[PDB]
Every structure is written in C-alpha cells, then in structure tokens.
Symmetry: C2
Subunit: 208 residues, 2 copies
C-alpha cells in the first residue's frame, strides 16, 4: 500500500524510511533517474514540481514533512495528547529549518561555506539538547516517552551532521546518547546496516 | 487562554490572528520593539531565537506553523479525517515554501529581484488553483468542506501577493473567488477591516 518515489538518494526520504522500517511496515521504492527527471514530464505532474512523491493506496502526497505527519498520525507516532502533538510539531519544524540550511550548503556552497557552517552548528544543535534535558533528563525521546515522527527526522539530521562535521555532538551528551540509543532499536539497527540504506549516498551531488 | 508575542507587523502572525478572529477566539497581543529584540535577552529565551512565541494556558509554542497546526488540531480545523489532514498539511507546507521565497525577496533582494519574482509567480500560484479545481469545483475550501488552518495561511499569502503584484490572481478564477468569499466571512471581514490589522505594516522593513 506504500510507495516512495524519489531520486537514488537518502536525502529527504531517509527519516520516513527509518520510521517505516522501525515500525515493521513494508513499502515499495520507485527510483527516478536524473535523465527521467530532466525529460520533464514526471516533474510537470508533481504538485509543486518536486520529489518525494508518496502513495498510500490512492492517496498521493508531496512534501517530505507531510509524509512524516501522515505516517505519524496513522501509526500513532504523534504524542499522547494534543499538547504533546504540538511539541512534536515544534521539534519537526525546528529540524526542517536546520535541514534547509544543510541542503543549501550541500547544493550551493559546499567548498566555500562549510567552514562557516560547522562553526554556526553548535548554536543550531543546542535547542534540541535543551529539549532533551527538559524531557526526563534526555533518557527517552525528544517528546514524551513514546517515539514520534520528529524523532526519526531529528535522528537523521544528527546522523548526517556527524558525517559532515565528525564529533559535532561531543558538545552535546544527551544528543550523543540519543543517537546511539535510537540507532540500537532492533528493526532500525538492522535497516541502518542494510545495503538498501548503506549503498545510497546522502545527497545527489556526492557531497557530504 | 491565548497570548501572541511578536513584532508590530502582520508578517508570520497574520494567518493565525485571522484564524483566531474568524473562529471567535480571544487573545492578548504582547508587542516586541526593535530595541527590546536587539537588547537580546528575549531572543536568548526563544527556543530557536525567533518570534512568534505563543502561549496557550501553560503551553508555550514557537514556530508559526506549529501554532497554526495547534489551533487547527484543538479547534477542529484540520479536515474530516486522516486523508484530509494529510492534504491540509500538503497545502500548508506549499504555502510555507512560497512564503519563504516572498520573505527572501522582501528582506534581501527586493529592488533587483522583484521583476523575476513576479514573472515566476503564476507558476508558484498554479498549484493552489489546481487544488481548488479538484475540490468541489473550488466552491468550498482548499481541502474538504470545512475551513482548515491551511485556508487562513493560504488567504494571507494570497492577500500579500496582490499587494506585491496587483492583478496576480486575475488569470486564476478559483483563487480569485476563494479570496473574495473567505474575506467576506463576517468575523474575518470585521478583523481585516480593523485598525489592529489595517494599521500594521505587512513586513518589518516597510517593503511590500
Ligand atoms: Ca505511540
Ligand atoms: Ca471544523
Ligand atoms: Cl521555519
Ligand atoms: Cl518545503
């Protein structure tokens, strides 16, 4: 019933894939080549002219965070009540903002901008350390005591930043422990080690 | 029990205030000056160093789209079911993308950038016209048969684009009629007509 339509990349599909794997859900991957993409007709049929496209039976979705929220809702990964749901959105929106900066660097300014970016990174990572510290000493999840879609998205942003700036989480013991703890969940651990995850590059220009 | 904390501009709070007014809700406006913000300690206290900040009883939220989704969730402005909720998100995420482009023009590149922006604009508006055409001939709301938080956000975005590029909606009949019809909802009409709206500038730099 689920189909992910994307480039041969981790990118904006890494978090939703981790979620689906961790939750024991099956899905199909439909891969779009650069050639298919540049021919232009699939792009023309995309709502906002972008991928991922996601299919849930006859429901067609665009926008990676829409997909995340949809699976959160359907799979019960959206907090225990309405106040937790708001906190879950607040984290995800914050994650989305640092991801936009991360993509901008990768695409438009990797070589010249990297140095500056890695320097501003501690200040960008701190709110998430704070959020953990205020949630049972950072011992469980980013919101409440059950996993949410924001957890998968944050885990991913943190994995890719440790690739970009190895040791960037040394400054943040709760975020460091959170990564190890979430990465060690049985289904997720198995998925993160698999060729289907491992043999995809993070980004499409090979920069990371 | 609602408080809005923001600069004295429409900006990223216009949609949520429209929502609150149209839905018959009461709120407090806490204004923040340039000098208070530059003083630095309110900025330091914000989760992501940004306004708006929103209080709802003992709940404190940041991120305008978090606040919007929170009011949608708690006031029942989020579609009739999960499939609609997902379309609502997809609409709002689209509204957010174009708003980011708008802000970027207004704040960084208005004079040199405006021409290209207005030429690119029909392509950026066309998805929302299409979404209307596929939902009861564009006769009700952006999604389903009841108002959602995404309608308020879309309407704001459309209103500010008519100031920027007067006539931008002329080629779009469903978007044109939608703006007229939603703007005519009695509580919303009185709010858009009010001094607390009319006498605020759209953006902080006086450009529009
Ligand atoms: Ca759960
Ligand atoms: Ca309703
Ligand atoms: Cl944002
Ligand atoms: Cl987006």
């Amino acid at each position: 019933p689920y189909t992910v339509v994307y480039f041969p990349v981790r990118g904006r599909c890494a978090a939703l894939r981790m979620l689906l794997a961790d939750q024991g859900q099956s899905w199909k991957e439909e891969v779009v080549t650069v050639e298919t993409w540049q021919e232009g007709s699939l792009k023309a049929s995309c709502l906002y002219g972008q991928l991922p496209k996601f299919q849930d039976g006859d429901l067609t979705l665009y926008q990676s965070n829409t997909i995340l929220r949809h699976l959160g809702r359907t799979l019960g990964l959206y907090g225990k009540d309405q106040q937790e749901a708001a906190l879950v959105d607040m984290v995800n929106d914050g994650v989305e903002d640092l991801r936009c900066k991360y993509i901008s660097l990768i695409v438009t300014n990797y070589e010249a901008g990297k140095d500056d970016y890695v320097k501003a990174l501690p200040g960008q990572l701190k709110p998430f350390e704070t959020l953990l510290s205020q949630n049972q000493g950072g011992k469980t999840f980013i919101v409440g005591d059950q996993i949410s879609f924001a957890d998968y998205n944050l885990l991913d942003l943190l994995l890719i930043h440790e690739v970009l700036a190895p040791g960037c989480l040394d400054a943040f013991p709760l975020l460091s422990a959170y990564v190890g703890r979430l990465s060690a969940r049985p289904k997720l651990k198995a998925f993160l080690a698999s060729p289907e995850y491992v043999n995809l590059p993070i980004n499409g220009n090979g920069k990371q």
